[PDB]
Design a protein around this nucleic acid. Sequence first.
RNA 1: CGCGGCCCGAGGCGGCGGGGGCGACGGGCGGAACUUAAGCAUAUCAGUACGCCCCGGAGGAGAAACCAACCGGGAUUCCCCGUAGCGGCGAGCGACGCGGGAGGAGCCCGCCCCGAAGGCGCGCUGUGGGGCGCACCGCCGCGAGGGGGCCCGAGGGCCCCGCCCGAGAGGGUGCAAGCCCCGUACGGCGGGCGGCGAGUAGCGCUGCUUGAGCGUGCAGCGCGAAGGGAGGCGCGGCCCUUCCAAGGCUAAAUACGCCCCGGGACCGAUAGCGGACCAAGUAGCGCGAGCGAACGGUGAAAAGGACGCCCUGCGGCCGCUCAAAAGACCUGAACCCGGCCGGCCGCCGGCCCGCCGGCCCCGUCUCGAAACACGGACCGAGGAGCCACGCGCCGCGGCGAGCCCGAGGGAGCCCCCGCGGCGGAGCGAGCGCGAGACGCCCCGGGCCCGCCAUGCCCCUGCGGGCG
RNA 2: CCGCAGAGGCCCCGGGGGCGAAGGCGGCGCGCAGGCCCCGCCGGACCGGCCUCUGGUGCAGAUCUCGGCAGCAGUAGCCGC
Lengths: 135, 211, 49, 117
Amino acid sequence: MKLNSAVTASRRKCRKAYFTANAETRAKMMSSRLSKELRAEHKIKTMPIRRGDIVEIFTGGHKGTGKVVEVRRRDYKICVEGINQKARNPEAKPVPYPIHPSNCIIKELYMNGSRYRAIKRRQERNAERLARIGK
Amino acid sequence: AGVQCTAHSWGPGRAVARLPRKHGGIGAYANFARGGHMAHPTTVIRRWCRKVNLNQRRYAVASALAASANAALVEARGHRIADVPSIPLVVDTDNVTKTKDALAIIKAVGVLRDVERCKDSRHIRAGRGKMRNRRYITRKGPLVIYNTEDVARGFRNLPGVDLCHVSSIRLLELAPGSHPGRLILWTKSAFASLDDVYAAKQNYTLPRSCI
Amino acid sequence: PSAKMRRYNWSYKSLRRRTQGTGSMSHMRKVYRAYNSGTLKANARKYLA
Amino acid sequence: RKIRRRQTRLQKAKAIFPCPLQKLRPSVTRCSQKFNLTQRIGRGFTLRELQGVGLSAGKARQIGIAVDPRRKNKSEESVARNVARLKEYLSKVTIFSKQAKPEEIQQAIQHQGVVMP
RNA sequence: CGCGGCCCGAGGCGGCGGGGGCGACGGGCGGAACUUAAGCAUAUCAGUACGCCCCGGAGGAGAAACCAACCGGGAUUCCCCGUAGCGGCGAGCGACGCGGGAGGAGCCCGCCCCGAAGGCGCGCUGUGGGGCGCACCGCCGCGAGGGGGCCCGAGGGCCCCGCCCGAGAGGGUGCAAGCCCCGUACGGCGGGCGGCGAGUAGCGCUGCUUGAGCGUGCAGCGCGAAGGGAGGCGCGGCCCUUCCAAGGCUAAAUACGCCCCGGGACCGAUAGCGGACCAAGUAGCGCGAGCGAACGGUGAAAAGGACGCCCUGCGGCCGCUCAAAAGACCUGAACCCGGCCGGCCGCCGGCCCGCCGGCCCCGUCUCGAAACACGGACCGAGGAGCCACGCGCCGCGGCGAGCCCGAGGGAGCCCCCGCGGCGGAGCGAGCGCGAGACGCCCCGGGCCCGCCAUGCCCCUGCGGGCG
RNA sequence: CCGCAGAGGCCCCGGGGGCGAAGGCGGCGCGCAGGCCCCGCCGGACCGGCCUCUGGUGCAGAUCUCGGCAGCAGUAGCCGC
Ligand SMILES: [K+]
Ligand SMILES: [K+]
Ligand SMILES: [K+]
Ligand SMILES: [K+]
Ligand SMILES: [Mg+2]
Ligand SMILES: [Mg+2]
Ligand SMILES: [Mg+2]
Ligand SMILES: [Mg+2]
Ligand SMILES: [Mg+2]
Ligand SMILES: [Mg+2]
Ligand SMILES: [Mg+2]
Ligand SMILES: [Mg+2]
Ligand SMILES: [Mg+2]
Ligand SMILES: [Mg+2]
Ligand SMILES: [Mg+2]
Ligand SMILES: [Mg+2]
Ligand SMILES: [Mg+2]
Ligand SMILES: [Mg+2]
Ligand SMILES: [Mg+2]
Ligand SMILES: [Mg+2]
Ligand SMILES: [Mg+2]
Ligand SMILES: [Mg+2]
Ligand SMILES: [Mg+2]
Ligand SMILES: [Mg+2]
Ligand SMILES: [Mg+2]
Ligand SMILES: [Mg+2]
Ligand SMILES: [Mg+2]
Ligand SMILES: [Mg+2]
Ligand SMILES: [Mg+2]
Ligand SMILES: [Mg+2]
Ligand SMILES: [Mg+2]
Ligand code: NA
Ligand code: NA
Ligand code: NA
Ligand code: NA
Ligand code: NA
Ligand code: NA
Ligand code: NA
Ligand code: NA
Ligand code: NA
Ligand code: NA
């Protein structure tokens, strides 16, 4: 149950916020769970999805694995190579089938200096959280 | 609303009805015209509240409390109390801050079937209202009454459960939907104090028992 | 060429048609922003003190 | 409005701790013949009562006493009643110097409501 | 014929101010009529609409030339409570004090003393200083916990077995998701003497205004002062009770649109704002002041229509994508209509089904409608005794000679505390006086109180008692 | 008493639902009636029996309002220069 009176629980307001979010909020809302092996390596659960990493689709009619080749931020959809609509002819450029990030698992992440710094920033902040509860 | 346009009646003699019209001839203003005002528009000066004497409020709360200790009424209302030892149910719980411990107690006193009754009944409401911030509905569970004890944090998140301090019991919680017999879990201190919370109502006498 | 503008209360529709807020309101927007979340108040306090 | 008034009261009480929110005010009789035999709270003490307790208007206002030089006493019973009131209040009032350590100031209790009903 | 000072004026230069905007709240002026009185002229609507002027975050008001009549209070403002009176004495209109709360705060100038001690190019036509004697918002963050099988275009579905909880508010995701994602619960940082206001107060005449009634407040003209003002009926006289006008400043408790945030037993596309639609005060109309619409919805994904065959081109067929054409699009009613297939005139009743019998067109005003009395071509959707306050009576609940969620205060929408008021005694224009004798209930008699008139007795006497 | 929209409750392992909700079309049954129920086809995501509460709560008419549309009718008409 919510106790913060400054946060709205109105359906109309929540949906309006969802449909008119700015760029960074949209990016954060497009996260996927990390695999068990990646969870052990970095002590985090989810990661914003980015072009260049590998995912596994675990639900829907287009299950599979592939590399992320495009992010459509104003639809909340991604295109992964090899997941296409069935073609009318064998000679036509494939049409990707857009997929929501919340039904895939990240298998391997494309690594940057900025990604490293962001992950390290994340870990050092839930370390305080864990130190402040339990143990 | 309905009176921001300029509209005046044409008279008789043009083969049209006598209501007010806009410059192009569109009907306006009347309650049977598209775009007009209400015949009697609703107003905020309506009386929204009602007055009840203090004596009758006290009588109602006392009678609902007395109904809560009847077992037959508690069963007639919706409650699964086959496994409950006694009515009233009094439990010495000390302080509970983890939901797991609250669930342990709930299972110990044989009241878990009423919590599961509510936990499995969540569904989406019919009609309008689901788009007015009233989307979900659940059944009503047991009510916990405490006093000088910390049980709220443990009991807050159990579906169907409601909490009350013993010095300010709410009537809308004793008789949900206007039906009086609700299952109550008392802490020991709450029962002992209720013994004399009624002695602090100055110059108040409990109504006499009858056959 | 009267110095004041022609405004009449017996027509709130024309007031509605032309009035403050029906244009860009550039300067007013900037000053209101600098006041509600900004340093206009700090500047005023320093200047007065 | 209820919540807002309470919040203002709490803030003001915090700003002047440990001085009470209200001042000491005299005991007066209700006017007409219909309420002749009962007392209520008045505006301020007269100068004769203060002379009875040997105080000045400045000192009285300094230690939280309301002073009303417009009012005149009409009998000695009123003077006696209000002199007794002042003596009680002076017996029950404590003053802190600028040399007192912060702790003992924290130990003080802030009075609530009317000073002596 | 000239030139120095003071006084009264003129032109220029420098530095600082003003002007205009804001459908609310606030202050000051000017100021209607419709309407009610079952007509209407005083009255009412209304000290309203509207016009003009002027500030602010509030404004205005404010430290007694006040109430009162008491075993008195004590600047202003705001909340609760309630009848004196005005009135074609008609219809109507209408305050304040006492009492309970919120809030609480006091002061100055002139006059008098000193006299340039001053803000020093000013100012003695007065700068500066003083009383003289006795005694709550913002910013930053982390944020737990689910698998197996079946079957679907996709499950958040069905069956089985689990986990998290200071988090089972919600939103998204291919179908009902605490554990798929974002969020939600749990943090940190910054902020004795001297002296009291003149074309004034008041009065006469006139106009407006008020509940203010031989004057509530204001104003014009004439007259015009020394101790003065007030005590809800005038004039003259004598007292008592209270205050000191004609100069000035002041926080709080209170009101409120635009704009921002939160919520709702509210509307759901002819509703809700005129305005849910990438373009609304828009397109369009008027010389102008102005007037002012209509228009929401493919699908999970545009995957938005393969190939082939006819065709002078326009187009058509066959099929393709999809769960589905859902093909410019959700569903797709009524009225009206085309094809094929069956029948022959409306309603009621009987029947082996076209025979027999019965039947004027509804709604309305009206003594009286089938009427040559009015309205109605047809279909869909909308469409008219609700709400507030006051009064009378009836039913029910609680308490009962009592009863009572006033405003408000306690950090508990529902808990605790909480004054008036109404009831308890009436009658009388008023000074005032003031009820027991009977009774299941009801009716009626009989007595008692007040008002009016009388007889007798007597104290404290136009007073008391008895009748 | 029947029906409409919404609120507070119940609906014995926690009401019915892509094994197909609302709505539309046709047909039985039940009720003096207002109405209700079931079946078949269409449709594609919601729905409500009983108790208490609430109201902008039921249409044939108003020379009613807004929208659609018929007969008349392949009719009148397409005569100045
Ligand atoms: K409209
Ligand atoms: K008037
Ligand atoms: K007639
Ligand atoms: K006729
Ligand atoms: Mg409307
Ligand atoms: Mg519905
Ligand atoms: Mg100049
Ligand atoms: Mg009128
Ligand atoms: Mg009239
Ligand atoms: Mg009339
Ligand atoms: Mg007339
Ligand atoms: Mg008037
Ligand atoms: Mg002011
Ligand atoms: Mg999380
Ligand atoms: Mg969800
Ligand atoms: Mg004076
Ligand atoms: Mg008048
Ligand atoms: Mg008098
Ligand atoms: Mg103020
Ligand atoms: Mg509209
Ligand atoms: Mg027949
Ligand atoms: Mg016949
Ligand atoms: Mg008629
Ligand atoms: Mg007639
Ligand atoms: Mg006739
Ligand atoms: Mg007829
Ligand atoms: Mg209708
Ligand atoms: Mg669907
Ligand atoms: Mg409604
Ligand atoms: Mg109709
Ligand atoms: Mg022809
Ligand atoms: Na101006
Ligand atoms: Na301003
Ligand atoms: Na529609
Ligand atoms: Na749909
Ligand atoms: Na006839
Ligand atoms: Na007629
Ligand atoms: Na006709
Ligand atoms: Na009698
Ligand atoms: Na149906
Ligand atoms: Na209606």
